[PDB]
C-alpha cells in the first residue's frame, strides 16, 4: 500500500498538463483561425486536430475511471461562458479546478452523470459562436469512450450523443451557409462521428434508417456545400454496403462525379480498395488490378496496423485471376506472414499446373476463406489454373498428343482435351494448329511482329507518365 | 570456343552455319539500367533526409 499509494499521485497531472493545454492551444488557436483565414479552410489546426485525436487514442484517451482525471469530462463541457470577453474568467476557472484536485481528492462523475453534462452546453446559453468547438468538447470524451465497450446502458448515451450531435447538426445546417468554414472543419468530425455511428451500430444492429439520414446528408451536400465531406460519406455508404447485398455495385456510377478533389490523400485510395473488390465482382481485372495496386502505393507510411495488410491480401487476388502474378513474399511483413500462411499456400498451389494440388487447398484451408468471404474467386480461379497448365505445355512442347496430355493435368478423358484447346484458341491463348485424326496437336512459334506493337503501347503509358511527373514537379516548384 | 558459329546434325550429318553478329544496340540499354540502379539508390538518401 505505501508504494502504490505514492505511485498514484504522479500520473494524473501528466494529462492534466498536456491535455489541458492541448485543445486549449489547438481549439483556442482554431478559435482565432475560424474568425478569419479561413483560407481555405486551413485551419491548419484541423490537421493538427487529426493528430490530437490520434494522440489521445493511443495515450491517454479520456478515461476509464482511474478515479483522478475523470472530472475533465464535465470540466471542458461547462463554462462557455458566454461571450469571448466573458470567457477569460472561465479560462481561469479551468485552472482553479487544478488547485481543487491538488488539495482534496478528485471527483469522478460519469455514466448517468453525463446526461446533464452533455446538456450543459445547451444549459450555459451559449457558446455561442463555434459549433465545432462544442462538438469537439463534447465528442473528445465521447470518442475514446467507445473504447469501454461495456454495452450496458452507456450505449444509449452514445445514441443520446448522436442526438445531441444532431442538434449541433441542425445548428450546422441552419447557421452560416455563406462562407461557412465551420462545415469544412466539421466535415472531418461528421466523418469520424459517422464512422463511430457505424462502429457502435455494428455492436447492436445494422442501420437501415441511419442510411436514410446519411443519404439525406449525402445528396444534400451537393451542390450547396461539399468540401471533403461527401468523399467520406460515399465511403461510409460503401463500407456497410459492400458487406450487405446488393446493387450497390452500379450505385457508384450514378454517384460519380469522381468525386474530386481526392481527399484526404490516402482516404481516397482506400475508396479505390472498396470499389476494387466491387469491380472485381464484375470479373474485369484490368480495371481491378490498377485500382488495387494504386491503393497500396498511395498509402504511407503506417503503422498501424492490419488493415494496410488486408488491403494487400485482396490486392493479389485479381492478379491471381489474371494468370500473371509476382511472388508475394517481397511484401512479406512479420505481422502479415503469420496471417496469410494458409493464403500463401493457396497462391503457391495456384501458380502450379497441378489441378489436384489446387483442390486440396480449398478443402483444408476453406475454413479461413469463409471468414474473408473470398469464395467468390475460388470458383472462377479453376479456369485460370487450367489455362496456366495449358500455357506452359504449349510453349514447352513442339508437338503434344491430346490423349497423353490428360494424365499429367488429371484431365481424365479424351473429350475435354479438345475443349480446353478449343476455348484456348477462342480466347487467343495458343496459336497452335490442331489436327483431329488420331488426333494430335502441333504447335508453332511465331515472332517478329512482337516489339512493333507491344513496346509502343507501353511507351504510351511511359511517356505520358513522365510528362505527368514533369507537371507535378512544376506545380510544387512554382509556389515560392 | 565461339571462334566458329553454326549447328550440326548427328542423324543427317549436316552442319549449318548461322550468324547474327551485332550485340551493340542492347548493350546500349543494358549498361544504362544497370547504373540507374545506383542512381535511384542515391536518390533515396536525399528523399530520406528532406522528410526526416
Amino acid at each position: 500500500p505505501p508504494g502504490g499509494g505514492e505511485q498514484e499521485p504522479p500520473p494524473p497531472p501528466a494529462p492534466q498538463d498536456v491535455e489541458m493545454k492541448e485543445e486549449a492551444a489547438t481549439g483556442g488557436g482554431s478559435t482565432g483561425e475560424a474568425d478569419g483565414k479561413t483560407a481555405a479552410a486551413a485551419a491548419e489546426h484541423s490537421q493538427r486536430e487529426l493528430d490530437t485525436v490520434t494522440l489521445e487514442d493511443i495515450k491517454e484517451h479520456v478515461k476509464q475511471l482511474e478515479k483522478a482525471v475523470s472530472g475533465k469530462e464535465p470540466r471542458f463541457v461547462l463554462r462557455a461562458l458566454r461571450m469571448l470577453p466573458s470567457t477569460s474568467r472561465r479560462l481561469n476557472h479551468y485552472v482553479l479546478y487544478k488547485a481543487v484536485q491538488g488539495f482534496f481528492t478528485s471527483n469522478n462523475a460519469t455514466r448517468d452523470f453525463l446526461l446533464p453534462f452533455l446538456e450543459e452546453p445547451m444549459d450555459t446559453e451559449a457558446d455561442l459562436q463555434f459549433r465545432p468547438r462544442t462538438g469537439k468538447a463534447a465528442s473528445t470524451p465521447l470518442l475514446p469512450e467507445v473504447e469501454a465497450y461495456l454495452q450496458l446502458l452507456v450505449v444509449i448515451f452514445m445514441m443520446n450523443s448522436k442526438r445531441y450531435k444532431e442538434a449541433q447538426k441542425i445548428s450546422d445546417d441552419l447557421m452560416q451557409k455563406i462562407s461557412t468554414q465551420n462545415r469544412r472543419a466539421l466535415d472531418l468530425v461528421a466523418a469520424k462521428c459517422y464512422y463511430y455511428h457505424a462502429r457502435v451500430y455494428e455492436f447492436l444492429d445494422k442501420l437501415d434508417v441511419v442510411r436514410s439520414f446519411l443519404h439525406a446528408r449525402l445528396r444534400t451536400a451537393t451542390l450547396r456545400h461539399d468540401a471533403d465531406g461527401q468523399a467520406t460519406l460515399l465511403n461510409l455508404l460503401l463500407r456497410n454496403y459492400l458487406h450487405y447485398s446488393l446493387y450497390d455495385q452500379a450505385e457508384k456510377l450514378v454517384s460519380k462525379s469522381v468525386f474530386p478533389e481526392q481527399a484526404n490523400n490516402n482516404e481516397w485510395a482506400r475508396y479505390l480498395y472498396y470499389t476494387g473488390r466491387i469491380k472485381a465482382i464484375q470479373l474485369e481485372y484490368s480495371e481491378a488490378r490498377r485500382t488495387m495496386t494504386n491503393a497500396l502505393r498511395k498509402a504511407p507510411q503506417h503503422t498501424a496496423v492490419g488493415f494496410k495488410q488486408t488491403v494487400h491480401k485482396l490486392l493479389i487476388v485479381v492478379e491471381l485471376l489474371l494468370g500473371e502474378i509476382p511472388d508475394r513474399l517481397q511484401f512479406r511483413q512479420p505481422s502479415l506472414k503469420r496471417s496469410l500462411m494458409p493464403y500463401f499456400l493457396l497462391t503457391q498451389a495456384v501458380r502450379t499446373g497441378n489441378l489436384a494440388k489446387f483442390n486440396q487447398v480449398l478443402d483444408q484451408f476453406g475454413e479461413k476463406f469463409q471468414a474473408d468471404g473470398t469464395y467468390t474467386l475460388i470458383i472462377r480461379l479453376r479456369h485460370n489454373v487450367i489455362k496456366t497448365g495449358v500455357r506452359m505445355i504449349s510453349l514447352s512442347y513442339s508437338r503434344i498428343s491430346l490423349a497423353d496430355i490428360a494424365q499429367k493435368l488429371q484431365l481424365d478423358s479424351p473429350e475435354d482435351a479438345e475443349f480446353i484447346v478449343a476455348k484456348a484458341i477462342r480466347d487467343g491463348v495458343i496459336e497452335a494448329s490442331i489436327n483431329h485424326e488420331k488426333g494430335y496437336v502441333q504447335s508453332k512459334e511465331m515472332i517478329d511482329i512482337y516489339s512493333t506493337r507491344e513496346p509502343q503501347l507501353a511507351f504510351h503509358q511511359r511517356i505520358s507518365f513522365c510528362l505527368d511527373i514533369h507537371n507535378m514537379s512544376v506545380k510544387a516548384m512554382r509556389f515560392p | 570456343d565461339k571462334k566458329f558459329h553454326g549447328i550440326l546434325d548427328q542423324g543427317e550429318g549436316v552442319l549449318i552455319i548461322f550468324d547474327e553478329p551485332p550485340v551493340d544496340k542492347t548493350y546500349e540499354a543494358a549498361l544504362e539500367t544497370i547504373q540507374n540502379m545506383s542512381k535511384v539508390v542515391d536518390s533515396l538518401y536525399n528523399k530520406a533526409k528532406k522528410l526526416t
Binding site: 511511359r462 511517356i463 507518365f465 513522365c466 510528362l467 511527373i469 514533369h470 507535378m472 514537379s473 510544387a476 516548384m477 509556389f479 515560392p480 | 540499354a29 544504362e32 539500367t33 540507374n36 542512381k39 535511384v40 536518390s43 536525399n46 528523399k47 528532406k50
Partner: peptide, 30 residues
Amino acid sequence: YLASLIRSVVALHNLINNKIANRDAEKKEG
C-alpha cells in the same frame, strides 16, 4: 528509356532542392 531516365532526374533536383528551400527558408522567417 533515356527519356524516362532523365525525367526522374529533373524531378529529383527540382523537387528536392525546392521543397528544402521552401519550408526550411520559410521557418526562419516566421
